[PDB]
Coordinates of C-alpha atoms and ligand atoms in Angstrom, one line a residue:
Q5 CA 0.1 0.1 0.1
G6 CA 1.8 3.1 1.4
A7 CA -0.9 5.0 3.1
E8 CA 0.1 7.1 6.3
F9 CA 3.7 5.5 7.4
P10 CA 3.6 2.1 5.7
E11 CA 6.7 0.7 7.0
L12 CA 5.1 1.2 10.6
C13 CA 2.2 -0.9 10.0
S14 CA 4.1 -3.9 10.1
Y15 CA 4.4 -4.2 13.8
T16 CA 2.9 -3.2 17.3
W17 CA 4.6 -0.7 19.1
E18 CA 5.1 -0.2 23.0
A19 CA 5.4 3.0 24.8
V20 CA 5.6 3.7 28.4
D21 CA 4.2 6.4 30.8
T22 CA 6.6 5.6 33.9
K23 CA 5.3 8.0 36.1
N24 CA 1.8 6.3 36.1
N25 CA 2.9 2.8 35.4
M26 CA 1.1 2.5 32.0
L27 CA 2.3 0.4 29.0
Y28 CA 1.0 1.2 25.8
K29 CA 0.8 -0.7 22.6
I30 CA 0.5 1.0 19.3
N31 CA -0.7 -0.1 15.9
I32 CA -1.0 2.9 13.5
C33 CA -3.3 0.3 11.1
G34 CA -5.4 -0.9 14.4
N35 CA -4.8 -4.7 14.5
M36 CA -2.5 -5.7 17.3
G37 CA -4.6 -8.5 18.3
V38 CA -5.2 -7.7 21.9
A39 CA -8.8 -9.4 23.0
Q40 CA -8.8 -7.0 25.9
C41 CA -8.4 -3.9 23.7
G42 CA -10.8 -4.7 20.8
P43 CA -10.2 -5.5 17.3
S44 CA -9.8 -2.1 15.9
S45 CA -7.9 -0.4 18.8
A46 CA -5.0 1.6 17.6
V47 CA -3.7 2.6 20.9
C48 CA -4.0 0.3 23.6
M49 CA -3.2 1.1 27.4
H50 CA -2.4 -1.4 29.8
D51 CA -3.0 0.0 33.4
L52 CA -0.5 -2.0 35.2
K53 CA -1.5 -1.0 38.6
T54 CA -5.1 -2.8 38.2
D55 CA -3.9 -4.8 35.3
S56 CA -6.6 -3.9 33.0
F57 CA -6.6 -2.7 29.2
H58 CA -8.5 0.3 27.9
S59 CA -8.2 1.2 24.1
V60 CA -7.3 5.1 24.1
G61 CA -7.6 5.4 20.4
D62 CA -9.3 3.8 17.7
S63 CA -8.2 2.9 14.3
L64 CA -11.5 3.6 12.7
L65 CA -11.6 7.1 14.1
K66 CA -8.4 8.4 12.8
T67 CA -7.6 12.0 11.4
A68 CA -4.4 12.1 9.4
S69 CA -1.9 15.5 8.8
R70 CA 1.4 15.7 7.1
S71 CA 2.9 15.0 10.4
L72 CA 0.3 13.8 12.7
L73 CA -2.3 11.1 13.7
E74 CA -4.9 11.9 15.8
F75 CA -7.2 8.9 17.1
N76 CA -10.6 9.3 18.8
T77 CA -12.5 7.0 20.7
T78 CA -16.1 6.5 21.8
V79 CA -15.1 6.0 25.5
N80 CA -16.3 9.4 27.7
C81 CA -13.8 10.9 29.7
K82 CA -13.4 11.8 33.2
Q83 CA -14.1 15.0 32.2
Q84 CA -17.9 15.6 31.0
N85 CA -18.4 16.3 27.3
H86 CA -15.0 14.9 26.0
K87 CA -14.0 11.3 24.6
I88 CA -10.8 9.5 24.9
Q89 CA -8.1 10.4 22.4
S90 CA -4.5 9.4 21.5
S91 CA -2.4 11.7 19.3
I92 CA 1.1 11.1 17.8
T93 CA 3.0 14.0 16.2
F94 CA 5.6 12.6 13.6
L95 CA 9.1 14.3 13.1
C96 CA 11.7 13.3 10.3
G97 CA 14.3 10.8 11.8
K98 CA 17.2 8.9 10.4
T99 CA 16.1 5.5 12.3
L100 CA 12.8 3.8 12.3
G101 CA 12.8 5.0 15.7
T102 CA 10.1 4.9 18.6
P103 CA 6.9 6.2 19.5
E104 CA 7.9 8.2 22.9
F105 CA 5.2 9.0 25.3
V106 CA 5.0 12.9 25.9
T107 CA 1.9 13.4 28.2
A108 CA -1.5 12.5 29.0
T109 CA -4.3 14.5 30.2
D110 CA -7.4 12.8 31.7
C111 CA -8.7 12.7 28.2
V112 CA -5.6 12.6 25.6
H113 CA -2.5 10.7 25.4
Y114 CA 0.4 12.2 23.4
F115 CA 3.4 10.7 22.0
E116 CA 6.2 11.8 19.4
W117 CA 7.5 9.4 17.0
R118 CA 11.0 10.9 15.2
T119 CA 11.0 8.1 12.5
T120 CA 12.3 7.6 8.6
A121 CA 8.8 7.2 8.0
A122 CA 7.8 10.7 8.4
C123 CA 10.6 12.4 6.2
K124 CA 10.0 14.1 2.9
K125 CA 12.3 12.2 1.0
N126 CA 12.4 8.4 1.0
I127 CA 16.2 9.0 1.1
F128 CA 16.5 8.3 4.9
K129 CA 14.6 5.1 4.8
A130 CA 16.3 1.6 5.0
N131 CA 15.4 -1.1 2.5
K132 CA 14.0 -2.7 5.6
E133 CA 14.2 -2.0 9.3
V134 CA 12.9 -3.4 12.3
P135 CA 11.7 -2.1 16.0
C136 CA 14.8 -1.8 17.8
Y137 CA 14.2 -1.5 21.4
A138 CA 12.1 -3.4 24.1
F139 CA 10.8 -2.7 27.7
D140 CA 11.3 -4.8 30.4
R141 CA 8.8 -5.7 33.2
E142 CA 10.2 -2.6 35.4
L143 CA 9.0 -0.5 32.1
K144 CA 12.6 0.6 31.6
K145 CA 13.5 0.9 27.8
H146 CA 16.6 -1.1 26.2
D147 CA 17.1 1.2 23.2
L148 CA 19.8 0.1 20.4
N149 CA 18.9 2.8 18.1
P150 CA 22.1 4.5 18.7
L151 CA 23.6 1.7 17.2
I152 CA 22.0 1.5 13.9
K153 CA 24.2 2.4 11.0
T154 CA 22.9 4.5 8.1
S155 CA 26.0 3.7 6.2
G156 CA 28.3 0.9 6.1
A157 CA 28.5 -1.7 8.8
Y158 CA 30.2 -3.5 11.7
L159 CA 33.0 -5.9 11.0
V160 CA 32.2 -8.9 13.4
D161 CA 35.0 -10.5 15.1
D162 CA 36.1 -14.1 14.4
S163 CA 38.6 -16.4 13.1
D164 CA 38.6 -16.8 9.3
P165 CA 40.9 -14.6 7.3
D166 CA 38.9 -15.8 4.3
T167 CA 35.5 -14.8 5.8
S168 CA 34.9 -11.0 6.7
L169 CA 31.5 -10.9 8.5
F170 CA 29.7 -7.4 8.1
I171 CA 26.5 -6.6 10.0
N172 CA 24.1 -3.8 10.7
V173 CA 21.7 -3.3 13.5
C174 CA 17.9 -3.6 13.1
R175 CA 18.3 -3.0 9.1
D176 CA 20.1 -3.7 5.9
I177 CA 23.4 -2.4 5.5
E178 CA 23.5 0.6 3.3
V179 CA 26.1 -0.7 0.2
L180 CA 25.6 2.3 -2.0
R181 CA 26.8 4.8 0.4
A182 CA 29.6 2.7 1.7
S183 CA 33.3 4.0 1.8
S184 CA 34.6 0.2 2.4
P185 CA 35.6 -1.2 -0.9
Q186 CA 34.9 -4.5 1.2
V187 CA 31.1 -3.6 2.2
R188 CA 30.6 -2.2 -1.3
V189 CA 30.8 -5.6 -2.7
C190 CA 27.6 -6.9 -0.3
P191 CA 24.1 -7.7 -1.8
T192 CA 21.5 -4.9 -1.4
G193 CA 19.0 -5.6 1.4
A194 CA 21.5 -7.8 3.6
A195 CA 21.6 -7.1 7.3
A196 CA 24.3 -9.6 7.3
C197 CA 26.8 -10.0 4.7
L198 CA 29.9 -12.5 4.4
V199 CA 32.6 -11.5 2.4
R200 CA 34.7 -14.3 1.3
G201 CA 37.2 -12.2 -0.7
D202 CA 36.0 -11.0 -4.2
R203 CA 32.5 -12.3 -3.2
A204 CA 30.0 -11.5 -1.0
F205 CA 26.9 -13.6 0.2
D206 CA 23.6 -12.3 2.0
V207 CA 23.4 -14.4 5.1
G208 CA 20.9 -12.9 7.0
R209 CA 18.2 -10.3 6.4
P210 CA 15.8 -8.2 9.1
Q211 CA 12.5 -9.7 9.8
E212 CA 11.2 -9.5 13.5
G213 CA 11.8 -6.6 16.1
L214 CA 14.2 -6.9 18.8
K215 CA 13.2 -9.2 21.9
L216 CA 14.1 -9.3 25.3
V217 CA 14.9 -12.5 27.1
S218 CA 16.3 -11.4 30.4
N219 CA 16.8 -7.8 31.9
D220 CA 20.2 -7.8 30.4
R221 CA 20.1 -9.7 27.2
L222 CA 18.5 -8.6 24.2
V223 CA 18.4 -10.9 20.9
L224 CA 18.1 -10.1 17.2
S225 CA 17.5 -12.8 14.3
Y226 CA 18.2 -12.3 10.8
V227 CA 16.9 -14.9 8.3
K228 CA 16.7 -15.9 4.5
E229 CA 13.6 -17.8 3.1
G230 CA 13.6 -20.0 0.0
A231 CA 16.3 -21.5 -2.2
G232 CA 19.0 -19.5 -3.8
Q233 CA 21.9 -20.0 -1.2
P234 CA 25.1 -19.6 -1.5
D235 CA 25.4 -23.2 -0.9
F236 CA 28.8 -23.2 0.9
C237 CA 27.0 -24.3 3.7
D238 CA 25.3 -27.7 2.1
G239 CA 21.6 -27.0 2.0
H240 CA 21.5 -24.8 5.3
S241 CA 19.4 -21.7 5.2
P242 CA 21.7 -18.8 6.3
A243 CA 20.6 -17.3 9.5
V244 CA 22.1 -14.9 12.0
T245 CA 21.4 -14.4 15.6
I246 CA 22.8 -11.4 18.0
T247 CA 22.7 -11.4 21.6
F248 CA 23.4 -8.1 22.8
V249 CA 24.4 -8.0 26.6
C250 CA 24.6 -5.0 29.1
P251 CA 27.6 -5.5 31.2
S252 CA 27.3 -5.1 34.9
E253 CA 29.9 -2.9 35.0
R254 CA 31.1 0.1 32.9
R255 CA 33.9 -0.6 30.6
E256 CA 35.6 0.2 27.1
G257 CA 33.4 -0.8 24.2
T258 CA 33.8 -4.1 22.8
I259 CA 33.3 -5.4 19.1
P260 CA 30.7 -8.0 18.5
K261 CA 31.9 -11.3 18.2
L262 CA 31.3 -14.7 16.5
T263 CA 30.3 -17.5 19.2
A264 CA 29.1 -20.1 16.7
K265 CA 29.1 -20.9 13.1
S266 CA 27.1 -24.2 12.6
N267 CA 26.8 -23.7 8.7
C268 CA 25.0 -20.6 7.6
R269 CA 23.7 -20.2 11.2
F270 CA 25.9 -17.5 12.7
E271 CA 25.6 -16.5 16.4
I272 CA 27.0 -13.3 17.3
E273 CA 27.4 -12.0 21.0
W274 CA 27.9 -8.3 21.4
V275 CA 28.6 -6.6 24.8
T276 CA 27.2 -3.0 24.7
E277 CA 25.9 -0.6 27.6
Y278 CA 23.4 0.3 24.7
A279 CA 21.7 -2.9 25.8
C280 CA 21.3 -1.5 29.4
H281 CA 18.3 0.7 30.6
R282 CA 18.2 4.0 28.6
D283 CA 18.1 6.0 31.5
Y284 CA 21.1 4.7 32.7
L285 CA 22.9 6.1 29.9
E286 CA 21.3 9.6 29.3
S287 CA 20.4 12.7 30.9
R288 CA 18.3 15.7 29.8
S289 CA 21.0 18.0 31.4
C290 CA 24.7 18.7 31.2
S291 CA 25.7 15.9 34.3
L292 CA 25.4 12.2 34.8
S293 CA 25.3 10.9 38.4
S294 CA 27.1 8.0 39.8
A295 CA 23.5 7.1 41.4
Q296 CA 22.0 7.1 38.0
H297 CA 24.7 6.6 35.6
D298 CA 27.5 5.0 37.4
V299 CA 29.5 7.8 36.1
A300 CA 29.8 11.5 37.6
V301 CA 30.2 14.2 34.8
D302 CA 29.3 17.6 35.1
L303 CA 30.1 20.0 31.8
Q304 CA 28.3 23.2 33.3
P305 CA 31.6 24.5 34.1
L306 CA 32.0 24.6 30.0
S307 CA 29.6 27.2 29.9
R308 CA 31.9 29.6 32.1
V309 CA 35.1 31.5 31.3
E310 CA 37.5 34.0 32.7
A311 CA 36.3 37.5 32.5
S312 CA 38.8 38.0 29.5
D313 CA 37.5 35.9 26.6
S314 CA 34.1 35.3 24.5
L315 CA 31.1 34.0 26.5
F316 CA 30.8 31.5 23.5
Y317 CA 32.8 28.9 21.6
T318 CA 33.8 29.5 17.8
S319 CA 34.1 26.8 15.6
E320 CA 35.4 27.5 11.8
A321 CA 34.7 25.5 8.9
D322 CA 35.4 25.7 4.9
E323 CA 32.2 27.4 4.2
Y324 CA 30.5 28.0 7.4
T325 CA 31.3 29.3 11.0
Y326 CA 29.6 27.7 14.0
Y327 CA 29.0 29.1 17.3
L328 CA 28.6 26.9 20.4
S329 CA 26.8 28.1 23.7
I330 CA 26.7 24.8 25.9
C331 CA 24.8 24.1 29.2
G332 CA 22.9 27.3 29.3
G333 CA 25.7 29.7 28.2
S334 CA 25.3 32.8 26.2
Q335 CA 25.3 33.1 22.1
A336 CA 27.1 34.8 19.7
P337 CA 25.5 38.2 18.9
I338 CA 25.2 37.1 15.2
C339 CA 22.7 34.4 16.4
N340 CA 20.4 36.9 18.3
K341 CA 17.2 35.6 19.4
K342 CA 17.4 32.5 17.4
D343 CA 17.9 30.5 20.9
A344 CA 20.4 27.9 19.4
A345 CA 22.8 25.9 21.3
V346 CA 24.7 25.5 18.0
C347 CA 24.3 28.0 15.1
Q348 CA 25.5 27.6 11.7
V349 CA 26.4 30.9 9.8
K350 CA 27.4 31.2 6.0
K351 CA 30.9 32.7 5.5
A352 CA 29.9 34.1 2.0
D353 CA 26.6 35.4 3.5
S354 CA 26.1 36.2 7.1
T355 CA 22.8 36.7 6.7
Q356 CA 22.0 33.1 6.3
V357 CA 22.2 31.6 9.6
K358 CA 20.4 28.0 10.6
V359 CA 20.0 26.9 14.2
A360 CA 21.7 23.5 14.5
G361 CA 20.5 22.6 17.8
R362 CA 18.4 24.1 20.6
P363 CA 19.2 24.5 24.1
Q364 CA 15.7 23.0 25.5
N365 CA 16.8 19.9 23.3
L366 CA 19.8 18.1 24.8
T367 CA 21.0 14.8 25.6
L368 CA 24.1 13.9 27.6
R369 CA 24.7 10.3 27.1
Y370 CA 27.6 8.1 28.1
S371 CA 27.9 4.5 26.7
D372 CA 30.8 2.1 26.1
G373 CA 33.6 4.7 27.0
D374 CA 32.3 7.6 24.8
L375 CA 30.6 10.9 26.3
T376 CA 28.3 12.6 23.8
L377 CA 26.3 15.9 24.1
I378 CA 23.5 16.1 21.5
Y379 CA 21.5 19.2 20.8
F380 CA 18.4 18.7 18.5
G381 CA 15.3 20.3 17.3
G382 CA 17.2 22.5 14.8
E383 CA 15.7 24.2 11.7
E384 CA 14.4 21.8 9.2
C385 CA 16.8 20.9 6.2
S386 CA 14.6 20.3 2.9
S387 CA 14.7 16.7 3.9
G388 CA 12.5 17.4 7.0
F389 CA 15.3 16.5 9.1
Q390 CA 15.6 19.0 12.2
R391 CA 19.2 19.9 12.7
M392 CA 20.8 18.4 15.3
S393 CA 24.7 18.7 16.3
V394 CA 26.7 15.9 18.2
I395 CA 29.8 16.7 20.3
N396 CA 31.8 13.7 20.8
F397 CA 33.5 14.6 24.1
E398 CA 37.2 13.2 24.7
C399 CA 39.1 12.8 28.0
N400 CA 42.1 15.2 28.1
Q401 CA 43.5 16.0 31.6
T402 CA 45.7 18.5 30.2
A403 CA 43.5 20.0 27.5
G404 CA 44.0 23.6 26.3
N405 CA 42.2 26.4 27.7
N406 CA 43.2 25.4 31.4
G407 CA 41.1 22.1 31.2
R408 CA 38.1 23.6 29.2
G409 CA 39.4 22.9 25.6
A410 CA 37.5 23.9 22.7
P411 CA 35.4 22.5 20.0
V412 CA 36.4 21.3 16.5
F413 CA 33.8 20.9 13.7
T414 CA 34.8 17.6 12.0
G415 CA 32.1 17.2 9.6
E416 CA 28.5 17.4 8.5
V417 CA 26.2 14.3 7.4
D418 CA 22.8 15.2 6.1
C419 CA 22.0 18.1 8.7
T420 CA 23.6 16.5 11.9
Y421 CA 27.0 18.3 12.5
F422 CA 29.5 16.9 14.3
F423 CA 32.1 18.3 16.7
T424 CA 35.1 16.7 18.8
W425 CA 35.9 18.4 22.2
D426 CA 38.9 17.2 24.2
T427 CA 38.4 18.5 27.9
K428 CA 39.3 17.4 31.5
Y429 CA 35.5 17.8 31.7
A430 CA 35.4 14.6 29.9
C431 CA 37.3 12.6 32.2
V432 CA 35.7 9.8 33.9
Ligands
LIG1 C1 -11.5 13.5 16.8 O1 -11.9 14.4 18.0 C2 -11.8 15.8 17.7 C3 -12.3 16.5 18.6 O2 -13.9 16.9 18.8 C4 -12.2 16.1 16.1 O3 -11.5 17.1 15.9 C5 -12.1 18.4 15.5 O4 -12.0 17.9 13.9 C6 -12.7 19.1 12.7 C7 -12.3 18.5 11.5 O5 -13.6 17.5 11.5 C8 -11.8 20.4 13.1 O6 -12.0 21.6 12.1 C9 -11.3 21.6 11.0 O7 -9.8 22.4 11.4 C10 -9.1 22.4 10.4 C11 -8.1 23.2 10.9 O8 -8.6 24.6 11.6 C12 -7.6 25.7 12.0 O9 -6.6 26.0 11.1 C13 -7.4 26.6 9.5 C14 -6.0 26.7 8.8 O10 -6.8 27.0 7.7 C15 -8.1 27.9 10.3 O11 -8.8 28.3 9.4 C16 -9.2 27.4 11.4 O12 -9.8 28.7 11.8 C17 -8.2 27.0 12.5 O13 -7.3 27.5 13.1 C18 -9.8 23.5 9.2 O14 -9.0 23.4 8.2 C19 -11.0 22.7 8.9 O15 -11.5 23.3 7.6 C20 -12.3 22.4 6.8 O16 -13.4 21.9 7.3 C21 -14.4 23.2 7.4 C22 -15.5 22.3 8.4 O17 -15.4 21.4 9.0 C23 -14.8 23.9 6.3 O18 -15.4 24.9 6.9 C24 -13.5 24.2 5.7 O19 -13.8 25.0 4.6 C25 -12.6 23.5 5.2 O20 -12.9 22.5 4.5 C26 -12.0 22.3 9.9 O21 -12.6 23.5 10.7 C27 -11.7 20.8 14.4 O22 -11.2 21.9 14.7 C28 -11.5 19.5 15.7 N1 -11.6 20.0 16.8 C29 -10.8 20.1 17.7 C30 -9.7 19.6 17.5 O23 -11.0 20.1 19.0 C31 -12.2 15.0 15.1 O24 -13.1 15.4 13.8 C32 -12.1 13.8 15.5 N2 -12.0 12.7 14.5 C33 -13.3 12.3 13.5 C34 -12.9 11.0 12.8 O25 -14.3 12.8 14.0
LIG2 C1 12.5 20.7 21.7 O1 12.6 22.2 22.1 C2 11.2 22.9 22.0 C3 11.4 24.1 22.7 O2 12.5 24.7 22.6 C4 10.1 21.9 23.0 O3 8.9 22.2 22.6 C5 8.1 23.3 23.1 O4 6.9 22.3 23.9 C6 6.3 23.1 24.8 C7 5.4 22.1 25.5 O5 5.8 20.8 26.4 C8 5.2 23.9 23.9 O6 4.5 24.7 24.5 C9 5.9 24.7 23.0 O7 5.3 25.8 22.1 C10 7.2 24.0 22.3 N1 8.3 24.8 21.7 C11 7.8 25.1 20.3 C12 7.6 26.6 19.9 O8 8.0 24.4 19.4 C13 10.3 20.4 23.0 O9 9.7 19.6 23.8 C14 11.7 20.2 23.0 N2 12.2 18.5 22.9 C15 12.1 17.6 23.9 C16 11.5 16.2 23.7 O10 12.9 18.0 24.7

C-alpha cells in the first residue's frame, strides 16, 4: 500500500508512561490482536496498577495530517463532554525510531515519533528496518537505535581470514553509500553479509523486531527464506542471531563477536551498554550522576569562562562558522534571538544563519566509553530533518584553555553536525 507511514504498520509498538505505570501498545493500522483492547484499537493502554486494558484510540476514528495522527474513541472521559483520544506527532528521523510518550491529560494521550517514515524524501528510509528496542518488566527502555548505522556496517570478530563478516543493527547495510571497498561488494537488502574475498553473500535479512529475554539480554534474528542460497553451507538456510548483553559494570566498548558458525547459522554476542536501561545512559541536563549512571560528569563549567574571553565558542569550517553556547551559556551576537545551542553562519553571506540545535533539546549520553552531548530540534532541512549537533567529548586532563578545551567541527552528514571536544571535564 503506502498510506500513512506504511513501514510502521508491520508491527505493534510499545511506549510507556513510567510516572503512571502505563504500558501502551500502538498499531497505526489497528490490529494488535489484544482481546482486551478490541479488534480496532490503534492505541491500547495496559494499566499495570489494576492490570486492565483500555483502548485510548481507535483505528477507525483516525484523522491524519502531514506529521500527525489523531485517534478518537467512543469512550467518555472523566471530564464531561470529552472522549478519550490519542495523538501522535511525527518528525523526520534517521532510523525507524520509537513512539515516545510525552504526556497525558485525563482525556488525551500524547506521543512523539521521530522516524524515517515521516521524512519528505524516502532518502533516509532503510530498505528494511525493524523495531530496535524493548521494555523490561520494570518499564525501563532498552534502546539499540544509537547502534543502527545509516552507512557502512560492523566488522564482526571471528577467526576466518577468508571470511569478513559484516552486520548492521535492525536493518540492511547501506552498500551504495559505503566507503569500505569491502562493504561495497555486499548485496542490497542484506543486514548480514559474508565476504569471502572478491565475493559477498547475503547471510541474513531483517524480519522481526528486537526481543528481550532477560533484563540484561536482547536478541535480534536475521533470516533468509527460499532457495538460491550461497550453498557453501550445504543446503542450510543462512541465519544470524545477535545477542546484545548489558555489562554489569561500565567498560570500554567491545566489538560484536562470533561465538558459533554451525553452517549458515551464525551466532554473535555483542556486549554493549546500549543494551542497558536507557536512563542509565542518558540525562536531559549537562550532568550524569553516580547514582543514576555509575559515572559522575558535569559539563556545566564549560559554559563559564574567565572575564577575559568570548562568552561562546567558535568552530570554523570551510564555508561556515559554527557558534556553540553549551549548558545554558550565552550565544554569539550574530545568532541573536534565534535560541540555539549551535548556530551555523554562512561565511559568504552571514545573513544566512541556521539553528543546528536548541538548548531545550539536549541529551548527554555515556555508553561504551564514549561521552556524547547532543543538541537537537534545529531548523528543518529540505529533507524535513530538524538539524542536530553531536559533540563527541574526549578526556584530556591537560586539554588547552585550562582544561576547558574548545570544540572542533569535524563534518556534516545530512544535517547532523559533528564536533570533537577534548576537555578535562570529559574525564570519568
Ligand atoms: C477527533 O476528535 C476531535 C475533537 O472533537 C475532532 O476534531 C475536530 O475536527 C474538525 C475536522 O473534522 C476540526 O475542524 C477543522 O479544523 C481545520 C483546522 O482549523 C484551524 O486551521 C485553519 C487553517 O486553515 C483555520 O482556518 C481555522 O480557523 C483553525 O485555526 C480546518 O482546516 C478545517 O476546515 C475544513 O472543514 C471545515 C468544516 O469542518 C470547512 O468549513 C472548511 O472550509 C474546510 O474544508 C476544519 O474546520 C476541528 O477543529 C477539530 N476540533 C478539535 C481539534 O477540537 C475530530 O474530527 C475527531 N475525529 C473524527 C474522525 O471525527
Ligand atoms: C524541543 O524544544 C522545544 C522548545 O525549545 C520543546 O517544544 C515546546 O514544547 C512546549 C510544550 O512542552 C510547547 O508549549 C512549546 O510551544 C514548544 N516549543 C516550540 C515553539 O516548538 C520540545 O519539547 C523539545 N523537545 C524535547 C523532547 O525536549
